[PDB]
Amino acid sequence: NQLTSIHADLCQLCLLAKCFKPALPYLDVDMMDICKENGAYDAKHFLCYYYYGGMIYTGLKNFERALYFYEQAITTPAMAVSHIMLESYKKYILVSLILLGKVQQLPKYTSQIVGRFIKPLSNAYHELAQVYSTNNPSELRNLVNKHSETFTRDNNMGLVKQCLSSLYKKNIQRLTKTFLTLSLQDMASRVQLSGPQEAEKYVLHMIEDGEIFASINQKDGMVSFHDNPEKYNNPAMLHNIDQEMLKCIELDERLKAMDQEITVNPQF
Amino acid sequence: SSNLLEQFILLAKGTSGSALTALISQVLEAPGVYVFGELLELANVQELAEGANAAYLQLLNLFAYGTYPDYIANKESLPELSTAQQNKLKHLTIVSLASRMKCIPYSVLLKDLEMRNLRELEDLIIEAVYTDIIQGKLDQRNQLLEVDFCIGRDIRKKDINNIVKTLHEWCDGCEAVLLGIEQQVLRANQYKENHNRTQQQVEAEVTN
Amino acid sequence: KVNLGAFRTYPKGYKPPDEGPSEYQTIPLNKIEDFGVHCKQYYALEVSYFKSSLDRKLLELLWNKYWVNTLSSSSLLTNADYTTGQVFDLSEKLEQSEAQLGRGSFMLGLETHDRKSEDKLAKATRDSCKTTIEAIHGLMSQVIKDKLFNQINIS
Amino acid sequence: YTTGGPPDPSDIHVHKQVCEIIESPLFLKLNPMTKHTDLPVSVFESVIDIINGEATMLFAELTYTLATEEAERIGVDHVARMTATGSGENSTVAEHLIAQHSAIKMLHSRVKLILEYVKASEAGEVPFNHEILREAYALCHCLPVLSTDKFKTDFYDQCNDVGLMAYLGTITKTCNTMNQFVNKFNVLYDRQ
Amino acid sequence: FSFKKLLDQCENQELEAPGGIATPPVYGQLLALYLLHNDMNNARYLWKRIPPAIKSANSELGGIWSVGQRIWQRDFPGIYTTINAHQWSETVQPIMEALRDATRRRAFALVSQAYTSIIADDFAAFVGLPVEEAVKGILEQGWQADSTTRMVLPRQLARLTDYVAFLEN
Prior knowledge:
Chain D is built from five helices and four strands, in the order βαβββαααα. By secondary structure, chain D is of the alpha+beta class. In chain D, strands 1-2-3-4 form a four-stranded mixed beta sheet, with helices on one face. The radius of gyration of chain D is 28 Å and the shape is flat. The termini of chain D are far apart. Chain E is mainly α. Chain E has a three-stranded antiparallel beta sheet with strand order 1-3-2. The B-D interface holds B 2, 5, 35, 37-38, 98, 103, 139, 141-142, 144, 146-152, 155-156, 159-160, 162-164, 166-168, 170-171, 174-175, 177-178, 181-182, 184-185, 188-189, 192-193, 196 and D 70, 89, 91, 93-94, 97, 100-101, 104-105, 107-108, 111-112, 114-115, 118-119, 122, 130-131, 133-134, 136-143, 145-146, 148-150.
């Protein structure tokens, strides 16, 4: 799994032609050590590859890989502002707001332009994470129509729509830690779903996707919220650890060859 | 016992007739004799029939092939026992189910031996531990009985094939594991030799 | 190097007033000041080697009947408190490595001699691998037992 | 061992008392003349064989080698030289694998000694005895020991505990080589 | 999987044989295979890739997308109504037949894992079977069925030795 200028252009073809099937064998495995011999890469290809690759994991319901892809395009240092760096920080907030409730901090080796120029220019995205911590669907709807002019000029339409449904799913998972068997009528007041009939339809979508495990008790008009009865004692879990450890022993062997090469060349 | 088995096989081959009928009841009454294979295949007990002589032949077959429920179903046709012959039949019932299955649940022994609790059911099993008859362990979580060592009832003329089959997998099975351990030593030793050579030749060229 | 050496401490009334180190080895930078003073209390001797003894001949007759105890392995349950207790000491070593990388032992004017214990990240690696090798060593004694006896079954 | 030359019939009666101690003894004879390639020594093993109906304990020569262990050669060379030894490989992994490699070889010999014992009683060698069959029937019946649902839920639980600790220790070894490469790359190649 | 091999062999011919615009019958095979695997994300993006001149000329592609519209909304009574309306007699018929079996299997794993006391009047609209046939098949499996209420109650050594020498030296 190597990287080059050809691999960066392959991700651009998947953006125009909406078909993420060929982009699966070339993105499911992490890549390292680019192919270099006479010069075939540039700084613009390293920022356009991570920006185009993050959009594939976003639509594929793969938020675990989308957060890592969008983080590499921000940590790259620069001297001024650019269109790629601006769209990378705006999408970093919308992705982190779906998984957790607050935006993750930036590393120490990040660029200073993001925290001095991109941060004040992205005032419409920074205020969105402040209201998300309060968990209020009435106040979140007022920010969509207010910042509608900013989401259209920055071609960010569709990414903010996933955060609207994420607040309703977060309130259901929040009641699982506090409450246990809440009534169907009481669940339509905190989450605000207008009627108990709309509450039974929203909880059924999380069962098919696998975000939470619950059981609807129609005999009493309530709903139960239990945890996952998995002690991780199946023999299939041991094979996942052995398969994941095969990539750790290979990454250390590759770093030993690069460390001996630098020691051969004279340094200060 | 073991010295008493060589005395009952010598008196049965010297006399016959009415003296053989009285010798069958003396073997089952005297403790220590837990084998009945060398006395059933003989031609002395086969000649006992017609009347009370035929009841002793059927009783010897139930003590080797039958179990405890097989005796209570025909107690009117077989002679009665005492306080020692009844307890000896319960020892053969435990070793009978162990020859077919490795683990026997407690619900099976509670129905065959007709008990009500677990200690009274296991009371006849622990008595055979000190006499080197039944040796094993008791399970409480799974409510099973893992019988490890037990008597072979008769002289083992039908289940003798499992003895050589179990020992063949223990001797031939060690050769397959030995090839994997020996191959792991050569792979681990070769990795240390290649790492020591690649770490000394790359550090000596730094000064030049 | 096979370190081996016999010494004999002189009693009261026979210690030399000045005597150099007869058998000098390696000493870490902590107790090196006491080596130049306590060396006059004893002296090294030229060690030799020969073949005789008697204890190395009766251990074979015992192994004919004591071989049932040599297979008592399963080190994962013997010193189980030492393996778990070693992870608590590793957390204290990892916390010291975070302050070493943040402050840095390479300052202006005086470098590679600022902190007391340097290379905290390199020393914490061997301590983390010690809890891993000792953990998998006890498992190897159990897997080898499930491949020679548990793989037999019965008909 | 003994000093003499050609094999004498008097040494056969002395070797018979040695088998009563160890199950696999060895014989050695020193010859003043040449015989092998290096030192004039030869090792023999007690091999019994029938000769015209009479079973005699003969001998069989073998070909010996050098040191077959790195952890042992470093201790033998330091004894005869009585000076110093060169720094080589201690083989720490080989010092721990002898506990499991020798256990299989020791268990493979114990099964072979009892395999021919029960097989001889069934064929025609050992006479048909009811005491031998009743003492070796339930001996192998206990196999396998503890192979039910109680051991299956405990063996997989112990493997997952040490398996997770191996992942946290493997990532620490990679960070050691990564720190040596980062410090050597951010100075010569990078200047910021 | 058996049906997963047909999807991988169909995408290779889509990016090799056509030079710009593909063929209608191939677009119907990729959209029908994506609906069986319950992958609405790849099925929605594939429908947008088709130019509008192909959808307006080929009426067979409109019937396939009509069944996929109810899958995104996850409406069980709305699946069987769209299947028996627009069908193609070529390569979609053997694929559309397997889609009806996946709908009943999807409700079996969803009701038995979220509805511990499903209503018998509403359970018939989730599997397609009538009310007189839904209460009969559940009794042969193991699920109870109450009366006068219409309520149904459903529900190694080679790897360890390699890590020893790797971490030690």
